[PDB]
Amino acid sequence: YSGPKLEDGKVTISFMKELMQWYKDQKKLHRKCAYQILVQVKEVLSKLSTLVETTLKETEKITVCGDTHGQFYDLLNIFELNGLPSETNPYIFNGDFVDRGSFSVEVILTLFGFKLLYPDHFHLLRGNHETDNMNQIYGFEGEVKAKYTAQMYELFSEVFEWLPLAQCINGKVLIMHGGLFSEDGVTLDDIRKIERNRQPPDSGPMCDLLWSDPQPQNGRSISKRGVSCQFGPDVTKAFLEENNLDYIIRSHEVKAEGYEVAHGGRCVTVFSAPNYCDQMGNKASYIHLQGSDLRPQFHQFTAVPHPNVKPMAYA
Ligand SMILES: C[C@]1(C(=O)O)[C@@H]2CC[C@@H](O2)[C@@]1(C)C(=O)O
Ligand SMILES: [Mn+2]
Ligand SMILES: [Mn+2]
């Protein structure tokens, strides 16, 4: 083994640079190093609140990315366009890191590595795909079994259970993978209090955060996905008012331009997997927020080449 090695058992910036190159070249991180990253990141995530609360000073910025779905070469493109993560270039990845794309292992270990390196500036929120039933079907479990072992997969599953479910910036912008709730009256404190270290239930606030979608018409509808609901602009308005928020950013749906702003400004979708599954032909985007101006600034990007491995090859 002549690949990336942790230094004194810990992630460093040089390790991360070596790792990204190793992965670009289609090589595998030694199982012992992967294991160390997973055990250490479990510890880090398990100490976090279900609702991560982050203050952005006036001179600070943050980048918000939506679904990446194992599109590792596109993840590298994000970092090339927007800079590597650091204490002055923080990131939030809003769920759905794995499944569908066939470089899910490379995406997730790169994301976990950066979480370890910059724990206060590199944020990961759970998506509906960071779950066992989804991973069993949509590629990630197959990919981990192919590259490592079932035991390694079990560890990933345990780590995913500790991913926080939402993040609030400056008490003004709430970020979650899916969206808002099937019942009125949910508060930020209710979210804080969710016991998240589990597979999601098929109903209730944890399910909704990971699974719901906005709809343009007022009200709520039964979801076509078979779980959670669609929520209209009236739902969003009431939730923002009760919680003293400005707007929400969510992900969870492909958008041709990589983003959408619904509910009159109140419900933003960001989606960061361009040409999704090598077929959708969509642009992707990421968002910049600034401490002095939390209105979203969209930055679009398009797919880059990757090795010839088909989406879902491991599913
Ligand atoms: C189909 C998708 C998936 O994750 O299964 C994939 C494509 C759009 C979005 O990401 C999706 C609907 C989601 O679950 O977030
Ligand atoms: Mn998704
Ligand atoms: Mn999703």
Experimental method reported for this structure: X-ray
Instruction: Of 56, 89, 53, 92, give the one whose Cα is nearest residue 286.
Output: 92
Q: Are 271 and 301 in contact (CB under 8 A)?
A: no
CA angle in degrees (0–180, nearest 5) for 304-308-310: 95
Pocket lining: 275 vs ligand 1, CB cutoff 6 Å: no
How far does the centroid of ligand 1 lie from the alpha carbon of residue 252, in Å? 5
List residues with catalytic annotation: 129
Instruction: Of 99, 77, 62, 70, give the one whose Cα is nearest residue 283.
Output: 77
How far does the centroid of ligand 1 lie from the alpha carbon of residue 15, in Å? 31
| Residue environment code for 254-263, b if the CB has 16+ CB neighbours within 10 A, otherwise e | bbeebbbebb
Pocket lining: 253 vs ligand 1, CB cutoff 6 Å: yes
59 Cβ contact list (under 8 Å, min separation 6): 291, 292
Instruction: Give the separation between CA 120 and CA 47, rounded to whole angstroms.
Output: 12
Pocket lining: 96 vs ligand 1, CB cutoff 6 Å: yes
Instruction: Give the separation between CA 9 and CA 259, rounded to whole angstroms.
Output: 39
Give the strand order in the sheet containing 259-262: 51-54, 166-169, 173-176, 247-250, 267-270, 259-262
What are the residues facing 60 on neighbouring strands? none
Domains defined along the chain, listed by start: 1-315 (3.60.21.10)
Amino acid at 217: Q
Residues with CB under 5 A from ligand 3 (ion): 96, 127-128, 252
Q: Residue 4 is encoded by which pair of tokens?
A: 């990336």
Furthest CA-CA distance within the chain: 58
Query: Quick one: which atom of ligand 1 is closest to the CA of 252?
Result: 15
Report the nearest-CA residue for atom 13 of ligand 1. Answer: 252
How far does the centroid of ligand 3 lie from the alpha carbon of residue 114, in Å? 22
Instruction: Of 85, 90, 95, 79, give the one whose Cα is nearest residue 21.
Output: 79
Instruction: Give the separation between CA 123 and CA 114, rounded to whole angstroms.
Output: 9
Pairing outcome for strands 293-301 and 284-290:
antiparallel
What are the residues facing 285 on neighbouring strands? 300
Report the nearest-CA residue for atom 3 of ligand 1. Answer: 252
Helix axes 13-24, 104-117, angle to 10 degrees: 170
208 Cβ contact list (under 8 Å, min separation 6): 178, 179, 180, 181, 182, 228, 229
Tokens 């058992």 belong to residue: 9
How far does the centroid of ligand 1 lie from the alpha carbon of residue 88, in Å? 30
Pairing outcome for strands 166-169 and 122-125:
unpaired
Pocket lining: 67 vs ligand 1, CB cutoff 6 Å: yes
User: What does each C-alpha distance from 283 to 29, 30, 166, 191 come to in angstroms?
Assistant: 30, 34, 25, 32
Pocket lining: 177 vs ligand 1, CB cutoff 6 Å: no
SS (H, E, C) the chain: CCCCCCECCECCHHHHHHHHHHHHCCCCCCHHHHHHHHHHHHHHHHCCCCEEEECCCCCCEEEEECECCCCHHHHHHHHHHHCCCECCECEEEECCCCCCCCCHHHHHHHHHHHHHHCCCCEEEECCCCCCHHHHHHHCHHHHHHHHCCHHHHHHHHHHHCCCCCEEEECCCEEEECCCCCCCCCCCHHHHHHCCCCCCCCCCCHHHHHHHCEECCCCCEEECCCCCCEEECHHHHHHHHHHHCCCEEEECCCCCCCCEEEEHHHCEEEEECCCCHHHCCCCCEEEEEEECCEEEEEEEEECCCCCCCCCCCCCC
